[PDB]
Every structure is written in C-alpha cells, then in structure tokens.
Design a protein around this ligand. Structure first.
Ligand SMILES: *[C@@H]1O[C@H](CO)[C@@H](O[C@@H]2O[C@H](CO)[C@@H](O[C@@H]3O[C@H](CO)[C@@H](O)[C@H](O)[C@@H]3O)[C@H](O)[C@H]2NC(C)=O)[C@H](O)[C@H]1NC(C)=O
Ligand SMILES: *[C@@H]1O[C@H](CO)[C@@H](O[C@@H]2O[C@H](CO)[C@@H](O[C@@H]3O[C@H](CO)[C@@H](O)[C@H](O)[C@@H]3O)[C@H](O)[C@H]2NC(C)=O)[C@H](O)[C@H]1NC(C)=O
Ligand SMILES: *[C@@H]1O[C@H](CO)[C@@H](O)[C@H](O)[C@H]1NC(C)=O
Lengths: 462, 104, 463, 103
C-alpha cells in the first residue's frame, strides 16, 4: 500500500489505476494524502460536514466519486475542476438543499449523477451547463415543487431521469423540451394534480413513463405525442374515465397500468391499434354499455372486463380475438351469446352473474382448448344437448344457480369439476359412471351426491 | 336391471324408474341402493314431480304415515293427531278426543 | 288351513281377528271370489284389472282400506263401493280414469283419505264428493285438470290436505276454495298458473302451508293476506318481479318462505315486517332495492343475505333490529360508510365485498366475539384505524384483497388462519412469521413478502 | 437489531430499515433474510418508495448495472448498450460504436 489513505482499503482497477475504499470509516473529513492515479474513490457513511480544509482536485484519473451518506450542506464552485475523467458522481443521502449552483458545470465526461435522498427544493438554471455526457439523472426523495424546465433544457443527452418522491404538482407544456434522447421518465409518488396538453411533446425517444401514485383527475392526453412509448403507468390516481382513441398516438405499447383508478367510463375505440398489447383488464367500469372495438390489436391473450352494463356482443366478436386464451365477462347484463367458435385458443371462460337465459348449440362449438367454463348465477332456462358435445379438453364446469331442470351429459365425459347447486328443478340422478375423475362435485340434492360416493349421515347441497 | 326399472348400475342399483313409479333410495351401509316401487312404504310418503317421483321419509315426531312432510296422515298410537301433527296435549282451539285418538 | 285367503294371495291377521289380504302384483284379470268377509285390508295393485265387475264383492263391511292402483281402470260404476261402511282409505292412482266417478264415490261416510293421482282426469263433476263427511286427505296430482272444480270442492269442509299439483290449471277464481275451513295443506305446484284472484284463497282459515312453486305467475300473490294461520309459503320458480309493501302483513307466525328463481327486482321496505318466527332471509339480485329493508317485529333472523342491489347506506342502528343474526352478506352493493355492527353480536360471518367502502373506523367492528370470517375484498378502503380489529377473538379468516391499502393494522388479529391482501399494490412492507402463527393460507401483493413466511399446518402463501 | 435497522425477526432478519436506507432480501434455502444497506449492490438497482426503499434485481439480458428494470445503465463488455438495452447489433436508428461500447 502506497498512497492508499491509512485505514482505507485499496485495489488495482486497470493495471496501475487505483481504486480507494474509505467507506464507513466515520472520517471527519477526507485524508490529505491521496495518490493521483486514483480511478475510484468511495467515501460513504462518513459524517463529512465540509469539503474541505484541503480538497483534492488534480485527480484527473478519477472515474467515479461516491459521496453518499455524508452530512454535506453545500458544494463550493471549484470543487470538481480537476476531474477530467469523472464518469459517475454520487451525492445521495446528504442534506443538500439545492443543486450545486456552478460546482457541477463542465464535467464533460460525467455520465451518471445521483442527487436523490437530499432536501433539495431549488434547481438553479444552468447548474447542469456543459454536461455533454450526462445520461442518467437521479432527483428522487427530494422536496421539488416544479419541473426545472429551464435547467433541464441543456441535458439533450439524458436517457433516464427520476423526479419521483417529490412534491411536483403540475407539468407545464414542453416542460422537457430539448430532451430528445430521453428514454425513461419517472414521475411517480408526486402530487401531480394537473398536466398540460403538450407537456411531454419534447421527448420522441421516450419508451417508458411512470405517472403512478399521483393525484391526477383526468387522463393524460400528452401521451399522444410519444410514438415510441412502450410502457405506461398512471395507476393509483383519481382518474375517472378513458377517452375515445386514448392510445391512438402510441402503437408498440406493451404494458399499461391504470388500476386503482376509479375508472367508470372507457371509450370503445380507446384500445385500438396496439398490436403488441397482450392483456386487457377492465374492472367496475359501470358506465360501459358496449363491448370495446379492438381493431389492429388482435394479439390479446387475456381479456377480462367486469362490473359494467354490457348488453350483448357483436356476433363476429371473436374475429377480433384470436390468440385470446382467457375471457372473463362476469357481472354484466348479457342475455344472448355469439358463436365463440372462432375464438379458439380459448382456455378459460367466466360468464357468471349475467342474465343469460339459454345456451344454444353453436355457442361453444369447436372450443378444443377450453378447460374451464363458468356460467353460474345466470338465468339459463335450457341448454341444447349437443352444446357441450365438442369440448374435449373441458374439465371444469360451473352451472350453479341457473334454474336448470335437466342436464346434457353428451360429450364432456370425465371432467374434473362439476357444479350444479341452485338448480332446484334438477332432481334426477347422475351415475358415478359417465363421470370418472370428478374431484369436485356440487349438486342440488344430497341423494344425488350419494350417487357419487359422498353424502354423510365434501360436496355439498345444504 | 330391476322390476320396473329402466336404468341401473351394478353398484348402486336402479337409477331411473319406469314412468309413474317412485324411486326409493335405501342405505345398505355404506353404499346407496335404488329400488323402484309402485308406491312408498310406511315411514315414506309418495312425492310426484315432473322429472322424478321420489319416496320421501317422514321426519315428523311420532308419525307413522304422512301426506307430505310437515303433515301426518295417521299418527303413532298412544298419541293424539291434530291437523297433520302429533301431540300428547292437542289444544284449545277446541279439540278433545272421541272414542278415537283424533283430537277434534 | 288356507282360511279362504284367495288362492295365490297372501293373508294375515290385523286387529283381534280382522284380516289383511294382499293380492297385489298377481296380474289378475279381475278380482277374486270367496275372499271371505272380515277383510280389513285389501291390496290389488299392478293387476291388469279392466272392469269392476262381473262379480263384485260388497258385504265387506269391515274393509278399512282398499288399494286399486296400477290396475288400468277407465271408469267406475255407481254402485261399486256400496257395501263398505268402514272404508277409511281408498287408492285409485295410476289408472286411466278420465274424470272423477260421477256418483260412485258418494256417501262413503267413513272415507278419510282418497288417492286419485297419476290418472288422466280432466273433469270433476259437481257433487261427486257429496256425503264424504270423514274425508281429510285428497290426492289429484299428475292429472289433466284445467281449472279449479270449485263447485265439487264446496262440500268438503272436512278436508285437511289437498294436492292439485302437476296439472294444467292456469287460473284461480276468487273464493275458489270457499267452504274448506278445515284445510291445512294446499299443493298447487307444477301448474300453469298465470293469474290468480286477489281473494282466491279467502276461504281456508286453517291453512298453514301453501305450495305455489314451479308456476307461471307474473305478480305477487296478494291473496296471501287472508291466510293468518299460514306457516310455510312457497312460490318460487315463477316469473314474479316484485314484493309489494306490507306483503306478509297478513301472515305472522310464518316460518319458511320460498321465492327464489323469481326475477325479483324490487322489494318493499316494510314488506318483511312482523314475522317473529322468520329465521332466514335471502335477497339476490334485487337491483331496485335502494334502501335497507325495515325489519320491525322480526328480530329472530339468523342469516341475512342481500346482494346485487343499490343499497347506499345503513341506518346507524340497523343492528338493533338484528340480534340473533349470525351471518350477514351485503356484497355487491354501493356502501361507502358503515354502521357500528357492535350491536350485532352472535355474528359469525360477514361478507361486504364489491362495495365502495373507503374507510374502516374504530367502532365499526368492536366486540364481535363470535366473528370468524370477514371479507372486505374489492372495496376502495384507503385506511384502517389500527384497533378496528383489536376485539375479534374468534376471527380466523380475513380478506382485504383488491383494496387501496398502503399499510396494515397488525394489532389484535394475531393468530388467525386465513389472510388475503393481494391487489394492495401500495402494501410493500414486510410481515413477520411471528405476529402470525397458525396462518395456513396467505395471499400477498408481492412474492418477497411471501418468502418471509418460507415459500419459494404446512402453510402456503401466493402472489 | 442490526446496522441501521429498526425491527428484526429471529427467522427473517431485519424487517424495517432506517429512513433512507434500502432493504436487501437474500433468499437462501427457501428462507428470506433482510439486510439494510446505504445503496444496492451491482445486479440490483435502487428503488425509492415512501413505505419501503428496496434493492431490486434487474433481470435484464447481459446487464451489469441498471437504472431501473427495463433500462440498463452499464452493460457487459462484449455487448453494445443501446437505449438501456444490450445487443450484439444495435441499429440503424443511427448508432455505431466508437472506442466505447455504447452504440
Ligand atoms: C438543445 O439541444 C440541441 C441539440 O441536442 C443543442 O444543440 C447543440 O449545442 C451544442 C452547444 O450548445 C453544440 O456543440 C457544438 O460545439 C462545437 C465546438 O464546441 C461547435 O463547433 C458546434 O457548432 C456546436 O456549437 C452541438 O453541436 C449542438 N447540436 C445540435 C444538433 O444542434 C442545443 O444547445 C440545446 N439547447 C438548449 C437551450 O438546451
Ligand atoms: C259448507 O259447510 C257448512 C257446514 O258448516 C254447510 O252448512 C250446513 O251445515 C249443517 C250442519 O252445520 C249440515 O248438516 C245438516 O244437519 C242436519 C242434522 O242436524 C241434517 O238433518 C241435514 O240433512 C244436514 O245433514 C248441512 O248438510 C250443511 N248444508 C248442506 C247443504 O249440506 C254448507 O252447506 C257447506 N256448503 C256446501 C256447498 O256443502
Ligand atoms: C291384460 O289384460 C288384457 C285384457 O284386458 C289381456 O289381453 C292381456 O293379455 C293381459 N296381460 C297380462 C300380462 O295379464
């Protein structure tokens, strides 16, 4: 060890470059004797009030400076002048109350800067001036109030930024103008109440946007301009409706999160043209009266839409839904049902608590992959015998509380689950044979259960 | 299959009875076994339904034969019969007992 | 000695020396001869008996019971049963009778029970039942009746039980059962009853059970009003749409009421008042119920479930109306604020899922000592006062799935069996194995929280 | 209890971290053990939240360190880094590679 600050632990970076770990030494200030050739300096969790009695610039080889968990209150302007090789700077978990006014300027090689977990509330404009290499910026867990749009304009090389866990309440138009290269933007856990119609118009390269855990009152239409957007989150807000053609501006969207929003209405065309979208979930949108249009977005694999007032389905609804595997339209007002035959690859169906009165023949024909079918709590007065004739993979079936009187045994032999409770008019018996492999049975009458080996003196009717 | 029975299983006996017959399910302990009768034995009563006519045991305290559940036809001797039910007493609406045990 | 027990038949001694003769499944062309009097029981059933008779046998003054079922009779001559002064029960089911014997059944003074079900009868001639003073029980199901034979029934003031089920009766005129004061049990199910008079049941004061099930009613049967001694009432599997205000005012001491498989949309609030003997009430999918129903003078409810409606809120003292209640299911309504529920002791299960509840205060579940299962899933519960669950010793199952929670009240609640918290995405903090022994089923918003319990008596946990 | 840790359990170690620290869960032999760090080790990325600050593995193909999931900060050598992701190629939108590997 030569030049490796006494008490600290050093190491070779590239050959003859020096990496110095003086972390968790509880130093009052940093050591005076520090070898140039240092390419990595870690000073973390070290109660460091000020820099310095003797600060050490001229370490032109310094690649990475870590200054976290230190009690710094400010940064002098000439502090980092020597460092021509600085790529990453870490200044988190300090009591900084504003971005260093000039101290950070013209670090030409600086690539990633962490200023999270401080008490910063003010960002002086052109504090980031001349940072041509800056790609990654942290400003979370701070006390910001507005977007420092002015200061952010110079950072045209930024690729990722976090303004999360602040107190930002509003986003002005063009608030991130010059940031053409930005790819990942995180605004979650703020108090964002309102945002402009052109507030995201700058960043064309943006792929992911996090607006989650905020206080938004309406859908963010600025979204329109983000053509390369891939992942979008604005859940846990107070939004009430999704407008027609809401995501028209953003094909190649893959994941969308808008849960924990009291969404009541959704436009029918709102989810059109998203070919890479795989799953759609819409719970408790009471004000939806029609099935949504899904033109140019046929690659849905899981569609669930419940708690609405949907009266009926387009008869060629399945034409829009190949690749669909699970379909859950429970708790609506459905009476008649389309063919569903076109919707192969369907494995699961949940149509409970609808007002369905009849099950026709073709309404479940050629569903070879279908394994689970729930039609419980409908008002199904009659089922055509051959309705279930062509469902080889069917194993789970629930027809509970349907006002049935008889049953179609044809096909369906040896399914695993069968539920018939609440069909009080269903009184005739059913043999254990015609039905091996039943592991769960529900039946309106105890003796009908006994016919399967159960019935005490485990199902049951009762 | 069985006497006047349309479909049976080797294990459980008769599953389906001829048109106007009643099915009686008997516990041979453990297995249930289905018999097909022209009418139901004492203890049971005849119940007609459009899918299945069934013999139904009469769980009425001290009843011998009955009209349905909840109504006894002829009560156990040593007990007075009043409006399909069987009491020691027999009210008070104004009954009393003739040369019979059928509290008027 | 044979005793003259009609060769092929099986006889045996009844009372002192009374004789019971079973000549049933013998496939007789007609009935025997000899067959000496003193017979107190005669069973001829399943016997291909075309006509009675070439030689009929009256003078059987001791006959208590005559069975003539499955014999394929097409008619009954007028003098057929003249000898039988002791006849109590006559069985004529599963024959091809097309109408009640016009006179043949008259003045059987001792006849107590008569079975005429499973025939093809469509006409009931008036005064065919004339002089049947002892008749208590009448079967006429599985026949082709079209209307109530009011005239013929008017004489039967001794009837206690009657079944006109599985016919095609479509309508009941007012006072259709006038004189039947002694009647207790009336069965009209599996008919095509579409409309019935408002005073169509005004006759029978002694009626205790009424079965109108499996019919084609469009409206509530308000005639019910007059049946004060009614105990059991069934009109399920119809097409009824509503229960009117004060629907069961006329029938206290009601115990069981069946109206399921009816598309009931509205229910009057006072409709279920004053039924102290009513034990269970279930109301599924009555969308137009907007207010909790009044239950004055009917406190002995043990299970109350009312779902699929628009109930906005509960009177703060609803539970005062609900002691003895054990199960409460008000799922799938529009509830925001909640009353004390403390008064509703003896409560074992509570289901309040898919409501719009935003907050759980302190007193809203205090002192529910018998409570075992509580479901508050799919609510919008943003906050829970910590001690809300402090006083729930018997609590074992808890479901808060799909709520707006960020944190959790561990206080009290220790050692329950089931815990479900999925869908609370703001719930990110961890949970210790201790503070929670005996947890055999767990659902958790994040997998890492599950791992804290040992997952990737045995216990489980899933994301 | 532990270094900057407020509550621990006998089985799982630390349950809650001091104000601005990150929790790191180490899953060994089907059991979780909780550590409290000032920041997350390589492979993990720092995620700040108001209830729990947590270290999160970035299971991103051939990534060494990352900004979040879905975005890689420092990619493995022998693989070009393009818009937070790591490819052999790297388009065509208009990238190319100097003396570095950051297309
Ligand atoms: C907004 O973003 C644009 C583009 O991202 C920025 O334009 C860039 O500005 C810098 C200097 O401000 C240019 O650097 C060059 O420096 C050399 C010598 O130092 C000189 O010869 C060049 O003519 C140029 O000044 C860079 O080339 C230029 N790039 C483009 C595409 O315009 C702009 O500065 C940003 N403006 C604000 C207010 O943030
Ligand atoms: C409906 O029921 C009442 C019975 O409360 C019928 O009123 C008449 O009631 C009397 C007894 O209260 C019946 O008996 C008569 O008794 C004397 C002996 O005291 C006897 O000599 C008479 O020949 C008769 O048996 C009387 O029969 C009965 N009236 C008739 C016409 O039978 C009322 O008639 C009943 N309604 C119908 C349509 O049957
Ligand atoms: C039943 O009686 C008819 C005459 O009415 C006769 O033709 C037939 O053979 C009889 N069948 C049996 C099984 O006795």
């Amino acid at each position: 060890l030569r030049g490796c600050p006494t008490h600290c632990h050093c190491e070779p970076d590239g050959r003859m470059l020096l990496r110095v770990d003086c972390s968790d030494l509880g130093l009052s200030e940093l050591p005076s004797n520090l070898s140039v050739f240092t390419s990595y300096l870690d000073l973390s969790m070290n109660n460091i009030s000020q820099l310095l009695p003797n600060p050490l610039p001229s370490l032109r080889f310094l690649e990475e400076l870590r200054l976290a968990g230190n009690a710094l209150t400010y940064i002098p302007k000439g502090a980092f002048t020597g460092l021509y090789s600085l790529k990453v700077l870490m200044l988190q978990n300090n009591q900084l109350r504003h971005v260093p006014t000039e101290a950070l300027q013209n670090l030409r090689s600086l690539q990633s800067l962490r200023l999270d977990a401080n008490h910063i509330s003010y960002v002086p404009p052109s504090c980031f001036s001349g940072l041509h290499s800056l790609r990654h910026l942290w400003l979370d867990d701070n006390a910001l109030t507005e977007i420092p749009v002015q200061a952010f304009r110079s950072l045209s090389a930024l690729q990722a930024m976090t303004l999360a866990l602040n107190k930002i309440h509003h986003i002005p138009d063009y608030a991130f103008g010059n940031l053409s290269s930005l790819v990942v933007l995180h605004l979650h856990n703020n108090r964002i109440h309102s945002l402009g119609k052109k507030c995201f118009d700058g960043l064309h390269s943006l792929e992911t946007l996090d607006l989650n855990y905020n206080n938004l009152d309406e859908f963010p239409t600025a979204i329109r301009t983000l053509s390369n957007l891939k992942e979008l989150g604005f859940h846990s807000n107070n939004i009430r409706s999704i407008p027609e053609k809401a995501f028209v501006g953003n094909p190649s969207l893959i994941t969308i999160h808008f849960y924990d929003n009291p969404i009541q209405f959704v436009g029918r065309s709102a989810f059109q043209h998203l070919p890479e979208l795989r799953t759609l979930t819409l719970n408790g949108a009471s004000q939806i009266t029609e099935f949504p249009d899904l033109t140019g977005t046929a690659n849905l694999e899981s569609l669930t839409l419940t708690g609405a007032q949907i009266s009926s389905l387009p008869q060629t609804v399945c034409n829009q839904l190949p690749n669909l595997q699970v379909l859950d339209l429970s708790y609506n007002l459905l009476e008649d049902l389309p063919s569903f035959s076109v919707c192969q690859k369907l494995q699961k169906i949940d149509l409970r608590h609808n007002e369905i009165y009849e099950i026709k023949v073709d309404t479940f024909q050629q569903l070879l992959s279908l394994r689970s079918l729930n039609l419980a709590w409908n008002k199904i007065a009659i089922i055509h015998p051959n309705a279930f004739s062509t469902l080889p993979s069917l194993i789970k079936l629930d027809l509970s509380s349907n006002l049935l009187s008889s049953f179609p045994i044809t096909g369906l032999h040896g399914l695993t689950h069968l539920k018939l409770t609440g069909n009080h008019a269903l009184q005739s018996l059913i043999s254990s044979e015609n039905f091996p492999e039943l592991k769960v049975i529900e039946m309106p009458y105890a003796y009908q259960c006994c016919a399967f080996g159960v019935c005490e003196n485990q199902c049951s009717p009762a | 299959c069985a006497k006047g029975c349309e479909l049976c299983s080797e294990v459980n006996g008769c599953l389906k009875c001829s048109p106007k017959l009643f099915i009686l399910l008997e516990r041979n302990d453990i297995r249930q076994v289905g018999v097909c009768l022209p009418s139901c034995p004492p203890g049971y009563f005849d119940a007609r339904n459009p899918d299945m006519n069934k013999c139904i045991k009469c769980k009425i305290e001290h009843c011998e034969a009955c009209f349905s559940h909840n109504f006894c036809t002829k009560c156990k001797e040593g007990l007075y019969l009043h409006k399909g039910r069987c009491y020691p007493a027999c009210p008070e609406g104004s009954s009393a007992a003739n040369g019979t045990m059928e509290c008027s």
